[PDB]
Amino acid sequence: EKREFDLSIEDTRIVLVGKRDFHTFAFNGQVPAPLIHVMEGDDVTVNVTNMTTLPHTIHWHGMLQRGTWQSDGVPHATQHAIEPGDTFTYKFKAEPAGTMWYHCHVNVNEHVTMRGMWGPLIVEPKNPLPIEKTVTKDYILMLSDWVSSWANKPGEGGIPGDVFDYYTINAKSFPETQPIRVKKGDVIRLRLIGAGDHVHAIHTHGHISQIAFKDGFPLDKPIKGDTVLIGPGERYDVILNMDNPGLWMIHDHVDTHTTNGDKPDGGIMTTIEYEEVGIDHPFYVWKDKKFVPDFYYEESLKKDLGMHNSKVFKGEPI
């Protein structure tokens, strides 16, 4: 099916945690960028208007671009970069299927690492595997690493001597992430995307992690474990059978990724909450938490195929 989407690139303020804000060059003014959810084989057109003062592109990471290399989105290799004020059109077939993503390919050490120029590109297989068909809830987790010294210095950063100090899932750090809420008998798919500069070791308590897909491609047999080491650019789809009611941590097991600046108990961390046990526990950090749906695109993935903006991810224009 033919599908046509429009994206703008806007100077945008976001807040990672507390008072830690950041200047971003955000697609449709949100970080992560809009979800693009299409069927394997769809013919996609994207029109990208640059409303910032710096050049950009969009590269579609995981798209083979068969016969369409001039839409690969690499400045000085497949196109002239999109200059401020200009519009560029990308045209490609959505293939192969799987957890893909898209990001700017200009000055990546700054733009992708710390300017939020990334979003998920989910391509549905025409014929999903049996394991895919057991999934009841589908989550996207984009992992990023930020250097706060460059928070309000657009056009700069991503250089030797940088001190990484904030770590996010979908551009929020714990305790401002959202819980993953389930019931016994659910099967969840965690689509982990290595959007950052660091390796992350994603560990889930109380459950068997079934690493079932790498870079969109199904593994011969899922690998069982409890910690998934994921590097920059990689994607892993982890399937978890929700057979064990409780309150359960999901976090980066690299301990320096669980801090917010110099404070512990932050960074890349959330929880799985089963409705069977409830959250009314005197010790529980999130007993009084106001839940925000769609923080992992888990509701938007249930909508009709297309591009989905998010009020959850929208920042403030600069």
Q: Which of the stretches 120-128, 136-144, 208-216, 299-307 binds a copy of itself when contact is defined by CB under 8 A?
A: 208-216
Strand pairing partners for 9? Answer: 27, 50
Query: CB 34 → Cu ion: shortest distance, Å?
Result: 16
**What contacts 24+ positions apart, CB below 8 Å, involve 210-214?**
210/131, 210/238, 210/239, 210/240, 210/241, 211/236, 211/237, 211/238, 212/131, 212/237, 212/238, 212/239, 213/98, 213/99, 213/237
246 DSSP 8-state letter: S
CB-neighbour burial class of residue 295 (10 A; exposed 0-12, middle 13-18, buried 19+): buried
Select from 121-129, 183-191, 198-206, 307-315 the region that touches a copy of itself (CB under 8 A): 198-206
Q: Does 262 bind a copy of itself (CB under 8 A)?
A: yes
Amino acid at 28: N
Among residue numbers 5 through 64, which ones bind a copy of itself (CB under 8 A)? 59, 61-62, 64
The residue ranges that bind Cu ion (CB under 5 A) are: 56, 104, 106, 111, 117
**x/- site string to a copy of itself, residues 150 to 169, per CB under 8 A?**
--------xxxxxxxx----
269 annotated as ligand-binding: no
117 is in an annotated binding site: yes
CB–CB of 65/153 below 8 Å?
no
In the complex, the smallest distance separating the C-beta of residue 13 from a copy of itself, rounded to whole angstroms, is 22
104 interacts with, out of a copy of itself, Cu ion, none, CB within 5 to 8 A per kind: Cu ion
In 3D space, the residue among 25, 17, 299 whose CA is nearest the CA of residue 156 turns out to be 25
C-beta closer to a copy of itself: residue 29 or 216: 216
Strand partners, 210: 224, 239
Q: Would the annotation count 23 as a binding residue?
A: no
For a copy of itself, the binding residues in 271-310 under the rule CB under 8 A are: 271, 277, 282-285
Q: Which residues are annotated as a binding site?
A: 56, 104, 111, 117
Q: Which residues are annotated as a binding site for Cu(2+)?
A: 56, 104, 111, 117
